[PDB]
Structure 1
Amino acid sequence: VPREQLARSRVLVVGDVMLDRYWFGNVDRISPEAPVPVVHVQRQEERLGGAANVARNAVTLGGQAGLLCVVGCDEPGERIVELLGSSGVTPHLERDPALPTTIKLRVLARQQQLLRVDFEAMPTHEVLLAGLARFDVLLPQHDVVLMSDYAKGGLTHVTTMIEKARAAGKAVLVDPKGDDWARYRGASLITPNRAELREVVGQWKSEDDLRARVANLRAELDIDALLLTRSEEGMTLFSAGGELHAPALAVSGAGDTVIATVATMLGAGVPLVDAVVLANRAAGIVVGKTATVDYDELF
C-alpha cells in the first residue's frame, strides 16, 4: 500500500479516553498511622490509554485519525491534550467541568504493584448529547468510524452513532466491552477476543460449533462481520461470504493495534480480508516491543 494512498485514510475514533499513569517508589518503612507500607515515589511515567491509544496507532501507519471523546477540566485533561498534539491525532474533545478525566494510576515498588487507583465518572447527559452533535459534523469528514468502548460512559449513544454512520455508507468498527452487545447493533465489524466472546455466546466445542454460534449472533445484531482474535491461534474473520484465518508470526495494547490497522486500511480503500491480514503482521510486531507499528515495518 502506497504511503500516499493511506495518507488520505481518515479514521474517526470515538469512545472512552484515559491516561495510564505509573508511580515507581521505594518502600522501606511502615506508616505510623496504619499497618500499611509507605511508598516514597521516585519517578512517574504516563501514556495515552483507551480510545487515545487506538487513535495513536492509525497515525503511525501513515494515516490520519480523529478522537471524539470526553475529558474533564483538570490536570490529566490538559495532559491528554498535550499527549494528543504530540502524536498526530486530531483532538475533538468535549469538556465536562464536573467530570474527572479517566486515569488508571498504578503504584509500584520493587517491580511489583501495591495498589491501583482509578478516577472516573459518568459524563452528564448534556455533555453526551453535545458530543453526539459533534459526531454529526465529524462523520462526513471521515472514511471509517471506530468505536472504542471501555465502559466509562462515552459510548452511551453508540447505537445511534452506528446507524448514522451506516446510513452514510461509512464502516463502523467496534472494540467491545462487556456482555451486552445489543448496543452494537448494526455495526460493520466487531472485534472481541476468545474470553470476550464467551460471556456473550458461552463456551463451545468445535470450529463448527463456534462457527454457527457466531453466525446467529451476527444475525440477531445486524452485525455484518466478527473478527475473533485468538492469541496463539491467530485471528478468524467471520464474514457471511466466508471465513479467513491468519496465524501468528513472532503483548499489551495489541488489541488496540489490530482494530486500528483494520480501520486505517479500510479508509485507504483496501479490501477487508487484506486489511485483516495486515492486522496480523501489525499484531506480530507490537508483541515484540505499549507500541505503535510504523509504515516502514509493516511492509
Structure 2
Amino acid sequence: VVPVPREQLARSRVLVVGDVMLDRYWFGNVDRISPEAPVPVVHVQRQEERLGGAANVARNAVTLGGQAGLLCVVGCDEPGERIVELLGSSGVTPHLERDPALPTTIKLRVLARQQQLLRVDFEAMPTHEVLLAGLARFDVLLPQHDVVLMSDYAKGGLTHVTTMIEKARAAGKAVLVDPKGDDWARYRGASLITPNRAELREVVGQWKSEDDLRARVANLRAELDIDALLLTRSEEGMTLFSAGGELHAPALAREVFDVSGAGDTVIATVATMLGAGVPLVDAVVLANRAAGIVVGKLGTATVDYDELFH
C-alpha cells in the first residue's frame, strides 16, 4: 500500500449515522459473596467512560486524520449529557437529535481483579417522531459529506436506513454499512457491507467451505445489489468480496489485549480512506492494519495516523 498524505485525509468527510452509546466501566473489589444470593459483591473503586457504537466509529475516523460528522439520537439523561460532553472534545462534529422519553444507550461493564463479571445494558427504541426529525436533518447533512457510514446496532436508530441509502446513492455518495440483524434487505444498494462471521452467518447460514462461503456471499450481493462485502474474521483477519475478486488479509495483531470495537475501527478506516480517494483494496489493507493495532489497546480505543503509518 502507498503511504497516505495527512492533508489528503484532511479532506475526507465521513457522515456516521447510527446507534450511539456510552461505554462505562466499573472497577472494584470482590472480597465476599452476597449475603442474599450465591453471587459476588463488587465494591466499585473507579469509573471510566469512553464513546461507543456509532460514536466509536466517528472518533476512529478523526484520530486517523479525517473529518467525521455524527448523526444520532440521544436521550435527555446523565449518560446523554456525558456523550455530548465527550463528543465536544473528540473532534467529531455532533448532530444529535434529542428524545426525552429515550434512555441513552449505555453499556456498563463491571470488573474485578482485571476480570469482567457482568455487562449491564440500558437501551430502547427512539420515538417515531424523533426518527423523522433525524431523517430530515439527514437530507440537510447529506450534501456536506463524501462517504455515508451506517453503524447499525439494532437500537432503532437506523429504522429508516433503506430510505437514507437510496438518497445517498442517488446523490452519488458511497454507502458503507455495519450490519446487524437478519433482514439485510434494508441494506439494498449499499456500496460496501462489513459483517463479522456471526452477522453474516445469520443471513446466509454457516458455510461448509470457502467455495461455499464464496457462493453464499456472491449470491447475497446479487440479491441485495451490494457492490462489495467485507467479512472480518477475528483472528483469521478479513476478506473482501467483490466482482473484482477476493482479497484475504491475515490478522496482523502482535498482542491481543482487548478486541471489543475492532469492527468499528475496520469500517471507520475504510470509510475515511475511501473519502481520501484511496482505492477500496488499499483501504481494506489499511483497515486490517488499523484493526491489528487497535486490538492491542485496552477498551474501545482508537488508532491515530502516526500509528497506522510512520
Q: TM-score range by the shorter chain?
A: over 0.9
Is 1:92 equivalent to 2:95 in the alignment? yes
- Which is worse superposed, 33-42 or 89-98? 33-42
CA change 1:246–1:30 in 2 (3 A) is closer
Structure 1: distance between partners of 2:63 and 2:12? 12
- CA gap 1:241/1:115 in 2 versus in 1, 3 angstroms: closer
Report the alpha carbon displacement of residue 113 of structure 1 after superposing the two structures with TM: 3.5
Question: How far apart are the structure 2 equivalents of 1:235 and 1:31?
Answer: 44
CA distance in 2, matches of 1:205, 1:136: 43
CA shift for structure 1 position 36? 5.2
Q: Does 1:182 align with 2:185?
A: yes
SS of the equivalent of 1:5 reads helix
Q: Displacement of 1:116 after TM fit? A: 2.6
User: CA separation of 1:32/1:274 partners in 2, compared to 1, >3 Å: closer, same or farther?
Assistant: closer
In the TM superposition, residue 33 of structure 1 has moved relative to its aligned partner by 5.9
Corresponding position of 1:276: 284
Q: Which blocks of at least 5 consecutive residues in structure 2 are unaligned? A: 254-258
Please, what TM-score do these two structures have when normalized by structure 2? 0.92
**In the TM superposition, what whole-angstrom CA distance separates every residue of 1:29-84 from its partner, at most 9, and x where no partner exists?**
55566665443221111111111100011001110001000111111111001111
2:124 alignment partner in structure 1:
121
Q: Which moved more, 1:266-275 or 1:142-151?
A: 266-275
- Could you tell me which runs of 5 or more consecutive residues in structure 1 were left unpaired when the two chains were aligned: none
Deviation sequence 1:227-247 (CA, Å, 0-9, x none): 111223322111112222222
Report how many residues are paired: 299
- Indicate the SS of the match to 2:31: coil
Greater shift, 102-111 or 15-24, is seen at 102-111
Report the identity percentage: 100
Which of residues 24, 31, 35 in structure 2 aligns to 1:32?
A: 35
- Out of 242-251 and 138-147, give the one that drifted further: 242-251
Q: 1:114 to 1:258 in 2, by over 3 A?
A: closer
Deviation of the 1:107 alpha carbon? 2.3
| Gap change, CA 1:28 and 1:298, over 3 Å in 2 | closer
Deviates more, 1:63-72 or 1:186-195: 186-195
Q: CA deviation at 1:248?
A: 2.3
Tell me: CA distance 1:27–1:173, structure 2 relative to 1, closer, same or farther (3 Å): same
TM-aligned CA deviation for residue 253 of structure 1: 1.7
Corresponding position of 2:220: 217
Spell out, residue by residue over 1:110-159, the C-alpha distance to the aligned partner (whole angstroms, 9 max, x if none): 33334332211110000000000011000000000000011111000000
Alignment CA distance shift 1:3-1:20 (3 Å): same
Q: 1:50 corresponds to which residue? A: 53
C-alpha distance in structure 2 between counterparts of 1:124 and 1:21, whole Å: 25
Superimposed CA distance per residue, residues 138-191 of structure 1 (whole angstroms, 9 cap, x where no aligned partner): 000000000001111100000001000000000110011122211111111000
Segment drifting more, 56-65 vs 209-218: 209-218
Q: Cα–Cα, structure 1 residues 38 and 274, in superposed 2: closer, same or farther, change >3 Å?
A: closer
* More moved, 286-295 vs 87-96: 286-295
**Aligned partners of 2:110 and 2:183: how far apart in 1?**
32
> Distance between the aligned counterparts of 1:246 and 1:114, measured in 2?
34
Work out the CA distance in 1 between the residues paired with 2:118 and 2:236: 33
Cα offset, 1:291, TM superposition: 2.3
* 1:68 aligned counterpart, secondary structure: strand
Tell me how far apart the structure 2 counterparts of residues 141 and 38 of structure 1 sit (CA, whole Å): 50
